Design an enzyme around this catalytic site. Sequence first.
Site, short mmCIF file in Angstrom:
data_model
loop_
_atom_site.label_atom_id
_atom_site.label_comp_id
_atom_site.label_asym_id
_atom_site.label_seq_id
_atom_site.Cartn_x
_atom_site.Cartn_y
_atom_site.Cartn_z
CB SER A 146 8.22 -12.98 35.64
OG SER A 146 8.87 -14.21 35.33
NE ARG A 202 8.40 -13.27 25.63
CZ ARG A 202 7.76 -12.19 26.07
NH1 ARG A 202 8.41 -11.04 26.26
NH2 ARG A 202 6.45 -12.23 26.27
CG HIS A 224 9.18 -15.31 31.51
ND1 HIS A 224 8.56 -14.81 32.64
CD2 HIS A 224 8.24 -15.56 30.56
CE1 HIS A 224 7.27 -14.76 32.35
NE2 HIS A 224 7.02 -15.20 31.11
C1 P8X Z 1 3.46 -13.88 32.60
C2 P8X Z 1 2.58 -15.11 32.45
C3 P8X Z 1 1.47 -15.00 31.41
N1 P8X Z 1 1.65 -15.46 30.25
C4 P8X Z 1 0.46 -15.27 29.38
C5 P8X Z 1 -0.69 -14.96 30.38
C6 P8X Z 1 -1.78 -14.07 29.73
C7 P8X Z 1 -3.09 -14.09 30.48
O1 P8X Z 1 -3.48 -15.26 30.78
O2 P8X Z 1 -3.73 -13.10 30.72
C8 P8X Z 1 0.09 -14.35 31.57
C9 P8X Z 1 0.27 -12.83 31.45
C10 P8X Z 1 -0.60 -14.65 32.93
C11 P8X Z 1 -0.56 -16.14 33.28
C12 P8X Z 1 -0.45 -16.46 34.75
O3 P8X Z 1 0.53 -15.86 35.42
O4 P8X Z 1 -1.16 -17.30 35.22
C13 P8X Z 1 0.34 -16.54 28.43
C14 P8X Z 1 -0.27 -17.74 29.21
N2 P8X Z 1 1.69 -17.01 28.11
C15 P8X Z 1 1.90 -17.46 26.84
C16 P8X Z 1 3.14 -17.83 26.35
C17 P8X Z 1 4.30 -18.02 27.22
N3 P8X Z 1 4.15 -18.08 28.53
C18 P8X Z 1 5.23 -18.69 29.14
C19 P8X Z 1 5.44 -18.71 30.46
C20 P8X Z 1 4.76 -17.86 31.43
N4 P8X Z 1 3.95 -16.83 31.19
C21 P8X Z 1 3.51 -16.32 32.41
C22 P8X Z 1 4.01 -16.96 33.48
C23 P8X Z 1 3.70 -16.73 34.94
C24 P8X Z 1 4.84 -16.75 35.96
C25 P8X Z 1 5.96 -15.82 35.61
O5 P8X Z 1 5.78 -14.83 34.93
O6 P8X Z 1 7.13 -16.20 36.06
C26 P8X Z 1 4.87 -18.08 32.93
C27 P8X Z 1 4.06 -19.31 33.35
C28 P8X Z 1 6.34 -18.20 33.37
C29 P8X Z 1 6.02 -19.42 28.03
C30 P8X Z 1 5.47 -20.84 27.81
C31 P8X Z 1 5.79 -21.83 28.93
C32 P8X Z 1 5.59 -23.25 28.48
O7 P8X Z 1 4.82 -23.56 27.60
O8 P8X Z 1 6.32 -24.10 29.09
C33 P8X Z 1 5.74 -18.44 26.86
C34 P8X Z 1 5.91 -19.06 25.46
C35 P8X Z 1 6.78 -17.29 27.04
C36 P8X Z 1 6.57 -16.14 26.11
O9 P8X Z 1 5.58 -15.34 26.46
O10 P8X Z 1 7.33 -15.96 25.18
C37 P8X Z 1 0.56 -17.32 26.09
C38 P8X Z 1 -0.08 -18.70 25.84
C39 P8X Z 1 -1.09 -18.73 24.69
C40 P8X Z 1 -1.62 -20.09 24.33
O11 P8X Z 1 -1.00 -21.09 24.45
O12 P8X Z 1 -2.82 -20.07 23.84
C41 P8X Z 1 -0.26 -16.31 26.97
C42 P8X Z 1 -1.78 -16.53 26.95
C43 P8X Z 1 0.04 -14.87 26.42
C44 P8X Z 1 -0.30 -14.63 24.97
O13 P8X Z 1 0.47 -14.86 24.08
O14 P8X Z 1 -1.50 -14.17 24.77
#
Ligand code: P8X
Lengths: 208, 208
Positions: free
Chosen positions: A15, A38, A41
């Site tokens: 990403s 970020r 992202h």
């Molecule tokens: C990178 C991938 C992944 N993100 C991890 C997840 C951790 C995991 O589930 O193992 C993993 C690693 C995998 C998820 C997946 O791809 O399906 C998780 C879901 N993201 C979280 C926060 C964030 N994610 C965002 C977007 C994306 N992230 C990912 C994407 C995938 C596509 C991409 O990278 O472009 C998109 C979706 C963009 C922003 C939020 C978006 C919103 O709310 O609108 C924000 C805030 C960005 C930031 O990290 O600062 C935690 C949510 C926790 C919760 O709510 O309980 C998380 C569980 C990690 C953590 O803190 O432990």
Amino acid sequence: PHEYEKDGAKIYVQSFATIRAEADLARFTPEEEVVVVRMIHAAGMVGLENHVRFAPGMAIAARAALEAGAPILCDARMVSEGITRARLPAKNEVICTLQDPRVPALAQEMGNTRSAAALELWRPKLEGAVVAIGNAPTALFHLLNMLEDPACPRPAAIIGCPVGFIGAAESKAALAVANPVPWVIVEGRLGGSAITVAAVNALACRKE
Amino acid sequence: PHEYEKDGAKIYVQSFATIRAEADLARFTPEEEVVVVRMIHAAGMVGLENHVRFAPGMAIAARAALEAGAPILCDARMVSEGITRARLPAKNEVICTLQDPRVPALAQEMGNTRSAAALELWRPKLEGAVVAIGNAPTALFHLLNMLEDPACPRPAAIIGCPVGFIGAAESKAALAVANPVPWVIVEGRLGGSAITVAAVNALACRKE
Ligand SMILES: C[C@H]1C2=N[C@H]([C@H](CC(=O)O)[C@@]2(C)CCC(=O)O)[C@]2(C)N/C(=C\C3=NC(=C\C4=NC1=C(CCC(=O)O)C4(C)C)/[C@@H](CCC(=O)O)[C@]3(C)CC(=O)O)[C@@H](CCC(=O)O)[C@]2(C)CC(=O)O
Ligand SMILES: C[C@H]1C2=N[C@H]([C@H](CC(=O)O)[C@@]2(C)CCC(=O)O)[C@]2(C)N/C(=C\C3=NC(=C\C4=NC1=C(CCC(=O)O)C4(C)C)/[C@@H](CCC(=O)O)[C@]3(C)CC(=O)O)[C@@H](CCC(=O)O)[C@]2(C)CC(=O)O
């Protein structure tokens, strides 16, 4: 069955590489660039970077405050609940006073929104705090008025990213003009809790 | 001091009127239009409507499920914490299993993300549920694979709005092609917790 990428750490790397290959990031310092990546992202939107503005030194100042144990004061639960506790460098408290039971009556007495009235309860934690406003333009405008009083405790930094059609763009443009403390904004209607959380998470830990 | 609009109920009305005056909403049925307006409001982005797609009857079906007391199953805390409890019609449970202590090891055993593995814990609440996926493309892809087994409980509706650069657009296009249950998506990279929450909040209560 549907086939898809299942390695989360890999998805993050891919990403960020896709964003750096498409985005217009040259004007940002190295410390600012990591925050902008970020935010893009979180938004799923290359182009968001054309709206991002930082006060000089804000990204360095906000990271130093978080490393020193500064609390993070949030206008909404979506912001406080989004901050990744594992990325916090110094057991930083993540606070949101919106749901405090005294807020509805205080908002009525003040003639303001619950989001703005809740900021009065930030006073004991505000000195040196990192403020994260991702929702409410009225919270950002009210904070600017609170900071016009020299008796008010002053935060180390303000992430001023409220979203919206009414008052949002104006609140952020007013924060940049007032320059009360180091700030970052998303100019215009864009912003929100996800972009705000991404800015906090980027500043909290040195590892993307 | 800074002057600004302080009446929250008024700001909501003005925001929705600005969106209806600018947006391209003609193709949506009356039930779909109210959902799209709230999604645009959450995103601060007129233009989002060009990416929104509903299965025929989804908005009517999802509102009926919420009025019947359906739980809302959320992929992330930003989604579960964003849903407005006051707008819920039938004391609906709002669930997120992401932080369950069994999730990290289950994800390791499954060779998948924590976001996808947590969906296995939705099984007891999944029949007739309203699913709200605003973050994780892997949760949406995994749900599609779970629903390929006829033994799996089936939700009443899926709000499939994960955001991102990697897998997001593909997961949502795959949901629309599979058509497992009534769905709504934001095609492409856009989506996120705020847009997903706005869709739930729009469907929960008949008053904007
Ligand atoms: C990178 C991938 C992944 N993100 C991890 C997840 C951790 C995991 O589930 O193992 C993993 C690693 C995998 C998820 C997946 O791809 O399906 C998780 C879901 N993201 C979280 C926060 C964030 N994610 C965002 C977007 C994306 N992230 C990912 C994407 C995938 C596509 C991409 O990278 O472009 C998109 C979706 C963009 C922003 C939020 C978006 C919103 O709310 O609108 C924000 C805030 C960005 C930031 O990290 O600062 C935690 C949510 C926790 C919760 O709510 O309980 C998380 C569980 C990690 C953590 O803190 O432990
Ligand atoms: C309409 C105005 C207001 N919204 C109320 C607030 C209630 C209050 O504070 O009195 C009031 C009424 C006033 C806030 C203000 O204008 O400063 C509050 C903050 N919005 C909440 C949720 C939502 N807001 C969004 C965006 C906006 N909303 C408003 C905007 C103002 C500009 C506009 O309307 O265009 C923008 C910012 C667009 C989406 C989230 C955006 C995100 O996270 O990215 C989402 C999900 C949309 C939805 O309602 O479905 C609750 C947050 C609760 C919490 O986290 O603890 C809230 C406290 C209402 C509630 O449920 O009680």
